[PDB]
């Protein structure tokens, strides 16, 4: 088949208009728009200070608050706080 | 737990075969990995499932990021048809994909060895459902074969992608991110998976063809 020539001529007028519009859509005055360590310091010092102030006084004056699963102690250790030994395990054999 | 995990694992494993988009392959792959983690909760081994979460996370973040690099480099055609020739088209992302789709299966001492193969060992050495074992076994074979097919159609074949090519990786942020996660998925699996307190009893006493069976199934 092919184009009817009416479509060819109408299409050519839209080619001229579309290319002139799209060439106009560039802005170019060559002045397009015009008006009419410290990070690590602040973010590892200021929230650390605020939270560590918050966690001593308010938090540990509320009694049932931050609580830790206790350190496991082993039969060869010695207790750092008072100072006394923990009795070692007995003989090994038949392995 | 483990019936549902085995059902998901076989279903999305068989569904991952004959998929011709990248991201849908990766989604079915991660669904199969979550199926193994539901099997890992079905057997009384939660800590191995958590280890698999960590290693899986490193691994498929690296894999998605590499595929996104390729898709933006190749004008977003995004499909496995019209994808082929990318090896030696700068091979940093091909190195990333072969390290990845190597690490998806059980490769004898890489990051994907520890989690997945301790999962299948503790799954085999337990009072299990006797069909879920076979489902996880067959789906390990299936993740081997779609890993091989994603490698073969993504990197190896004759180059089928249209001309005026601008394949580009001379790029700081891309190579820094892929670099950081390959350094992750090579070492951090072992570094995480070794220095933890043993919260369970490791099995460690298997016969023959029950420890070898992971590598046997991936090779076949």
């Amino acid at each position: 088949s092919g184009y009817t020539p009416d479509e060819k001529l109408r299409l050519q007028q839209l080619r001229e208009l579309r290319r002139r519009w799209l060439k106009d859509q560039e802005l170019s005055p060559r002045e397009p728009v015009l008006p009419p360590s410290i990070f690590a310091f602040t973010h590892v010092l200021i929230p650390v200070w605020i939270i560590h102030y918050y966690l001593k006084y308010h938090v540990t004056t509320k009694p049932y608050t931050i609580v830790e699963k206790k350190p496991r102690i082993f039969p060869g250790d010695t207790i750092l706080e008072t100072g006394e030994v923990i009795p070692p395990m007995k003989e090994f054999p038949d392995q | 737990m483990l019936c549902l995990g085995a059902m998901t694992t076989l279903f999305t494993a068989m569904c991952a075969l004959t998929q011709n988009d990248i991201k849908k392959i990766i989604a079915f792959s991660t669904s199969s990995q979550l199926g193994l983690m539901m099997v890992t909760i079905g057997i009384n081994q939660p800590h191995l499932a958590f280890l698999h979460i960590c290693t899986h996370a490193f691994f498929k973040a690296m894999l998605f990021m590499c595929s996104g690099s390729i898709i933006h480099s190749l004008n977003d055609e995004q499909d496995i048809r019209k994808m082929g020739g990318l090896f030696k088209a700068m091979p940093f992302t091909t190195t990333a994909l072969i390290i990845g789709s190597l690490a998806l299966t059980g490769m004898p001492f890489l990051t994907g060895f520890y989690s997945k193969d301790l999962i299948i060992e503790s799954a085999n050495t337990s009072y299990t459902n006797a069909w879920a074992l076979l489902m996880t076994l067959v789906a390990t074979s299936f993740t081997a074969i779609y890993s091989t097919r994603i490698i073969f159609f993504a990197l190896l074949g004759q180059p089928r992608f249209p001309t005026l090519i601008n394949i580009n990786e001379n790029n700081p942020f891309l190579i820094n991110s892929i670099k950081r996660l390959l350094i992750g998925s090579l070492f951090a699996g072992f570094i995480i998976s070794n220095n933890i307190p043993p919260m369970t009893i490791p099995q460690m006493t298997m016969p023959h063809y029950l420890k070898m069976t992971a590598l046997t199934v991936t090779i076949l």
Partner: protein
């Protein structure tokens, strides 16, 4: 200058990206080798899985019949 597209040809490659690619694949293979031989050998059982328990009758407790 940075990269430029080229038409109907194999693209050009800077030596930097290909030497980091070769380096990272080679270190992956180096890691699987030095983690295979030197330290673990976990693909083997590492303990001899025995036979049926001892294959010793009159031991472990059975009476003769």
């Amino acid at each position: 200058a940075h990269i430029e597209p080229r038409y109907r040809q194999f693209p050009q490659l800077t030596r930097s990206q290909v030497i980091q690619a070769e380096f990272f694949s080679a270190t992956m293979w180096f890691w699987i080798l030095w983690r295979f031989w030197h330290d673990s050998d976990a693909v083997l059982g590492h303990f001899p899985y025995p036979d049926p328990s001892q294959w010793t009758d009159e031991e472990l407790g059975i009476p003769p019949d």
